Design a protein around this ligand. Sequence first.
Ligand SMILES: [Cl-]
Ligand code: NA
Length: 129
Amino acid sequence: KVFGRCELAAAMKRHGLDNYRGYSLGNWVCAAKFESNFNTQATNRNTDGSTDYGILQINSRWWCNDGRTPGSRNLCNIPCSALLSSDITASVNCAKKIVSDGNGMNAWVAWRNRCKGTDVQAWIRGCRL
Ligand SMILES: [Cl-]
Ligand code: NA
């Protein structure tokens, strides 16, 4: 499913992401936009053989199991395919674990290079939340 800007904003807020670990909703919507262009089905292969899945492009090297990433962990205890659903519950729950890992949202490369330091509030502007 391809989410609308405000539609996703509302969905994330309901799932407890607004201000989670100090990160305002705008940060999460910005990351989603640049990681997957709001597409829950987005998949991207990495050089090391791992693959990124879903709306927030979670990596199979450490967070989910896709059966084709040798020596990987699966810290979120879930099939990577579950991160491609129209329902973002699985992605959100796993992202909460990731952002709490120690490096915050820097774990998401696109957020660091395109969201960090910007006026992220612009991403939820005009939204009925
Ligand atoms: Cl943190
Ligand atoms: Na894995």
